Design a protein around this ligand. Structure first.
Ligand SMILES: O=P(O)(O)OC[C@H]1O[C@](O)(CO)[C@@H](O)[C@@H]1O
Ligand SMILES: O=P(O)(O)OC[C@H]1O[C@](O)(CO)[C@@H](O)[C@@H]1O
Ligand SMILES: O=P(O)(O)OC[C@H]1O[C@](O)(CO)[C@@H](O)[C@@H]1O
Ligand SMILES: O=P(O)(O)OC[C@H]1O[C@](O)(CO)[C@@H](O)[C@@H]1O
Ligand SMILES: O=P(O)(O)OC[C@H]1O[C@](O)(CO)[C@@H](O)[C@@H]1O
Ligand SMILES: O=P(O)(O)OC[C@H]1O[C@](O)(CO)[C@@H](O)[C@@H]1O
Ligand SMILES: O=P(O)(O)OC[C@H]1O[C@](O)(CO)[C@@H](O)[C@@H]1O
Ligand SMILES: O=P(O)(O)OC[C@H]1O[C@](O)(CO)[C@@H](O)[C@@H]1O
Ligand SMILES: [Mg+2]
Ligand SMILES: [Mg+2]
Ligand SMILES: [Mg+2]
Ligand SMILES: [Mg+2]
Ligand SMILES: [Mg+2]
Ligand SMILES: [Mg+2]
Ligand SMILES: [Mg+2]
Ligand SMILES: [Mg+2]
Lengths: 314, 314, 314, 314
């Protein structure tokens, strides 16, 4: 038998890259941590803010620490930036959310790990300074969906690729590439509990989805509650996902460095779009490692519609 | 080591039941089919209306056919009712949805199997006639959530019990019992794409959730798109789930026999409620095996609120 | 898909048996314990007279204790016979070796669980008295080989059947039945370290295997060191297995109740033979629960050859 | 959590090596193929000279072919040497036995993959010429035991290390290092069916093991029938393993390049010894890729004893 492995896939690409490939042992060190996570999660009740939320976070760090490719780490789970010591230093800064949606593990709701990889280009000894660059400085990014199946969407400068983990061989087999997203969708996904809090554009948009001006049949609504779940659905059947700013929290809820920025690199890399409503999520220069941002991503056409609105209203 | 297995759990209950226990080899024949399903689904991309949708449906029938406990089967996937031939006949009629949400497998969205078990009490040779009884005639019912973990909630006359499948030992280990649902929740889950189509009560209700009359902070909104997913979330953190009638399809979308009725037996058995808005889902006498019904279930208090509305408006 | 499960297989046989089937929940309670064992063993180094040797022994007892089919248990790992208390009593006495060959786990040598099941026919409150009957009083017996694959050979009054555990579905799928053993083999398996200790027959036999009197090409020699491994090889390619008496230990080394007797029920049930050299292992009336016996089993023709010798010499 | 992975282990060693590390993606490409093999084998009966014997052989080649580290491959399963084409060429020549002991898979006997890695040092376009070097030119070698657990012993210039595959995470976790073998053992393992065929030394040796001249208690005898099984036992509890020349086949049965040579690199690297009786297996310059050699390996002291004999007799 032949083909295929992520590793077998990444390396073959970094050949023509043509690269020193430490990127490869990074995604490897990463996959292992992902495989460990995937197994822990399918047996949460047999194993008895969440415990593993801690558990994964380390788990992931330790694999990254020992990949010999990283020099600065950012975990949605750490006060400050973790610096890789001199023996194990690599040329990569990796931002990640060890386990997104643990606030909702209990529903056997799908959850996942989000990551972004920047090449530290500084010559200075590493520090947070290196972890605050624009999204557009991503060499590689993606996530890991621990759903009915454990997938991993990886986007790199070339395009978007999907890998499903075959539990038995403990390998991530490439099952789709290079993914691209329908130009227009039939779905809007947003937490409408905040109807009260939303701005006019969002309000008018949603309105436009429920009652088509032209009267086309109305969009669907899906909101799972797990970002990595929602986007991916969005990335597959297209559509749009919204976690916009609300007056109470002006900058949304999703952390840009490890949550918003990556989903964007992916979205844009698959033909999608990612905006705050005010600007491309990716061109935002961050000042705070844990700073948040509102986010509107998905099918290029739908995202525009919203934008035209936001523009209309500003 | 000791404890625990469903089987080890059911049998111990049918002892004081005190029963002939064929119910037991039914849930066994069932679990096997569930374990087969769970594995197929975690490797859908490596395996390449849905193919398995057929696959599971048989798979499930064959295990039930050979449980020697069943005499009539109803699959959301079959024109007519399947009758178990004389050699393999049991005293049970089992209604089920082999794989709910396959219309959404592609998102590694959680999916599942829903089932209901009636004791054929007739003395007539079996037929569909036996599969159309009120929900209240359920000896046992529940579902199987193939999410990040593969759980199985089983409700029986006594109460509601939850089992997580430990992948390694291929066993369903009891991880929660006897489940009961918060009396009031912080969530409403409904497809709002149909805002246009909904009736006044539903409309006014949702309105009341977004902007609290008393001004309590508004509910959350979650809609995953997979019934078995949504309810279970509902059953765990409580709340409410709605797939109400809309003028276009006056009786909702979810099939009562294999989808609505079971979720109700469960809901009510855990302290919840299940109404069409007009009546308890369970007291509906069905005329058509594949007949549908609208459904409002979840936290007892929330469900009432809606009801008081429906009453208010009728 | 359809077929096949042990359970699905045993039950279908106890139907025409036609039985009350508690035998079934016994092999079920058993299989679970076997599945637990199989998993522990494939990860012994990751888990860090042997520890599990204890572990399995309980594990097995607890499943048997709760099968509600047993009333007296014999473990190569217990000073006295375990009596099942009144609430959980069944009509079966089960003799077993939780984990044979743990003295050799370290070589990732194959190891296994050996069991025998007698129907207590007494009307007396149960006790060891019930666990000491002739082999010929076995209702069911077999073993579990935890090798490259985890098989389970089960022999019952009808014939011999083999089941391989499919790790994924946690089910024992029937892969061979009804097994029968070549009438003559090309192999002898015996620990020749004891050349010094062996009697003349054994000595002359072995001699006859290395240098054919007629000059046919000599037998093979295989000795793995794990009884359950050796016999099964013997049962598959036929041949003969010997652990005969030696002057130092006149009655061999293998314990009759849980080790020798079962292998015999199996052997004879597959067309093989099992002798001490003096008599059929099965007709021996035991006085001591932990009493041993020498054992010569395998291809009917080979076993005879040895016997004719033993006879020749006595 | 932290530690440990082979990869995580090899790479850390090739750092101080300090190497270009393609050796690493070789053992990786290798492990994958090993994981694929391990799974196929534990479900041989559910999957229905051997079929997989072919299957593995390719499987292994394809992973090696795509490791980008190899330039010439030798499979006990191929007429001639496989040359890696220009795009995928690496600086390594890898000799291997895809699946040793398939002649004995049927007994759920343990089986395995044996490999040896030479650095092609030639400047010539690659060919078999490169695959025929002395054992002493091994950069890395080892095997994979698919027994009750799936281990992998890897020996490299530094010492011998053992890795057990944790089925769940699909990772080879280091469980022992750096292995060394008892200086003397209590076991001899040899196929005595060939008593007739053996030479005087072998004969006298065995004789000396059954009846101690000094009268120490006699050795044990173990012969599993699977080389990778037997040696490893030998490597763990020490002892000695013999597959010596017999007049009928003067050069033994085990193929030096892929079977004998590696077991030696390992043995000697763990403090053991490996001789034909005439010379160190490792210093033999091969002329034929598929050429065989007799082999005597194991505890240093025991091996000598035999040697002193061979010397005594020549
Ligand atoms: O130099 P490295 O370690 O190969 O990293 C660069 C990698 O990043 C990429 O730009 C995509 O992530 C590839 O071109 C290449 O594989
Ligand atoms: O419950 P809310 O306010 O809609 O926020 C849910 C969001 O939070 C997360 O759980 C992470 O904070 C995401 O998975 C999801 O998009
Ligand atoms: O007679 P049976 O086959 O045991 O079935 C009855 C079972 O149904 C129950 O009412 C619950 O499903 C239990 O009392 C009992 O285990
Ligand atoms: O997409 P809609 O119209 O909200 O319906 C989704 C419903 O359909 C189902 O997929 C089954 O028909 C359920 O899982 C879910 O509740
Ligand atoms: O009465 P039970 O519980 O079915 O046990 C008897 C079983 O034993 C057998 O003799 C074989 O073990 C079968 O005839 C039958 O399945
Ligand atoms: O090492 P010896 O003396 O040959 O005995 C090995 C025997 O002991 C056992 O390990 C059980 O006592 C069997 O598996 C095997 O037949
Ligand atoms: O140059 P490479 O690709 O790292 O290969 C050399 C490897 O071989 C070794 O000699 C052992 O196999 C190590 O020193 C080193 O890891
Ligand atoms: O059956 P024999 O002649 O002892 O040879 C067995 C040998 O053959 C092999 O199966 C490989 O040829 C080895 O595993 C084992 O050492
Ligand atoms: Mg987190
Ligand atoms: Mg998060
Ligand atoms: Mg269906
Ligand atoms: Mg459905
Ligand atoms: Mg034991
Ligand atoms: Mg034993
Ligand atoms: Mg081979
Ligand atoms: Mg071979």
């Amino acid at each position: 038998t032949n083909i295929v492995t992520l590793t077998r896939f990444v390396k073959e690409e970094g050949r023509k890259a043509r690269g020193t490939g430490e990127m490869t042992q990074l995604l490897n060190s990463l996959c292992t941590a992902v495989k460990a996570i995937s197994t822990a999660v399918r047996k949460a009740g047999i194993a008895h803010v969440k415990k593993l939320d801690v558990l994964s976070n380390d788990l992931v760090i330790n694999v990254l620490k020992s990949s010999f490719a990283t020099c600065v780490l950012v975990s949605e789970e750490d006060k400050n930036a973790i610096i890789v010591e001199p023996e194990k230093r690599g040329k990569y800064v990796v931002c990640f959310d060890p386990l997104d949606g643990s606030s909702n593990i209990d529903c056997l709701v799908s959850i996942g790990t989000i990551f972004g990889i920047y090449r530290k280009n500084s010559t200075d000894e590493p520090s947070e300074k290196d972890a605050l660059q624009p999204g557009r400085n991503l060499v590689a990014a993606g996530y890991a969906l621990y759903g009915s199946a454990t997938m991993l969407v990886l986007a790199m400068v070339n395009g978007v690729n999907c890998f499903m983990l075959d539990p038995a061989i403990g390998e991530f087999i490439l099952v789709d590439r290079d993914v691209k997203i329908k130009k227009k969708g039939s779905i809007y996904s947003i937490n409408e509990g905040y109807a009260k809090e939303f701005d006019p554009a969002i309000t008018e948009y949603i309105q436009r989805k429920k009652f088509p001006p032209d009267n086309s049949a109305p969009y669907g609504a899906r909101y799972v509650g797990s970002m990595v779940a929602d986007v991916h659905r969005t990335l597959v059947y297209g559509g749009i996902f919204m976690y916009p700013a609300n007056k109470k929290s002006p900058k949304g809820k999703l952390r840009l460095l490890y949550e918003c920025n990556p989903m964007a690199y992916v979205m844009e890399k698959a033909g999608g779009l990612a905006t705050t409503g005010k600007e491309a999520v990716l061109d935002i220069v961050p000042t705070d490692i844990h700073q948040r941002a509102p986010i509107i991503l998905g099918s290029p056409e739908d995202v525009t519609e919203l934008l035209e609105i936001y523009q209309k209203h500003a």
